[PDB]
Design a protein around this ligand. Structure first.
Ligand SMILES: C[C@H](NC(=O)[C@H](Cc1ccccc1)N1Cc2ccccc2C1=O)C(=O)O
Ligand SMILES: C[C@H](NC(=O)[C@H](Cc1ccccc1)N1Cc2ccccc2C1=O)C(=O)O
Lengths: 165, 163
């Protein structure tokens, strides 16, 4: 759907980028993006795949290797080839009489499925992070804020999710 | 998006299926060739949302097998969601005519340095499901290799995490 795209960025005054990368299946993934950082400024998100760092393929790099590669890098014009959230998946649920789609969450992660709900009928999975509800990003938000977003939404609740890491 | 399918139990009271409990959901792990499941279009990695109008959410691998074993009569209803963990990746063949991955039993086991698989971030422990639209699950490695060589420079494949 989205072919890998190019991203260029600079280390901040403190020498940081705002990224925390995770090694999954001989590929590198964005595990954390600090707010108001170079990573967030260029559009990096939790779930994005880092294919290349400075023209070098990241295939089979350990997490510590990726972090050290970024540490040693020249603080200016750090390039990257990103593959937008490969494990992302969309699921549409419907609110019941009581105004709920039927699942429990903790730190933005789905923890349980309520019996006879839209989450149960649609097959929502547990141990999945909620990325976006009806278009707005919910990563980094407080649980109370996700709950507020869910109540202001209409009957049709379309969420994007991905396996947790 | 999901679809309702209707199966008929075979000669032995079996449906030709094996299911796996992944993250409080039910998934098709194996489909036997020429069986009631194969006929309706059930494939590996498909999600079983309901059996006989019952939400499969939370069911163990054992519970879902028991439900099917002790199912009432000849006809069985199922609500299915087509391969949720399916993802499509595109590679390009080099001078030697290769994209850069080693596979065994239809599963990607290694990525070759300085290749299109490496550049594209292709993941290991992933089953290949389709090569240029053509299904490859059930096929022997040589038939998969044969279809890989038949393709042009552009190799588009669908894959899913191995389970
Ligand atoms: C996604 C949303 N879930 C919730 O309304 C649940 C509360 C709940 C409602 C119905 C059945 C069972 C539990 N919350 C709301 C909430 C707020 C803060 C922290 C955690 C939670 C939580 O699990 C929904 O399914 O509509
Ligand atoms: C996808 C395809 N891969 C293969 O031709 C690999 C061997 C290979 C040759 C050269 C470079 C990288 C890997 N096969 C082909 C094959 C046939 C039967 C059993 C195992 C294998 C196997 O690992 C390609 O790279 O275009």
């Amino acid at each position: 759907a989205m072919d890998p795209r190019e991203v260029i960025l600079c280390k901040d005054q403190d020498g940081k980028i705002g990224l925390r990368l995770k090694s999954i299946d001989n590929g590198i993934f964005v595990q954390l993006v600090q707010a108001n950082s170079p990573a967030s400024l260029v559009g990096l998100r939790f779930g994005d795949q880092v294919l290349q760092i400075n023209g070098e393929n990241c295939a089979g790099w350990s997490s510590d290797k990726a972090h050290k590669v970024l540490k040693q890098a020249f603080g200016e014009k750090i390039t990257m080839t990103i593959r937008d959230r490969p494990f992302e998946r969309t699921i549409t649920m419907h609110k019941d009489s009581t105004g709920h789609v039927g699942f429990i969450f903790k730190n933005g992660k789905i923890t349980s499925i309520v019996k006879d709900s839209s989450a149960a009928r649609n097959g929502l999975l547990t141990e999945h992070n909620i990325c976006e509800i009806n278009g707005q990003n919910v990563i980094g938000l407080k649980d109370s804020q996700i709950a507020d977003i869910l109540s202001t939404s209409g009957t049709v609740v379309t969420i994007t999710i991905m396996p947790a890491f």
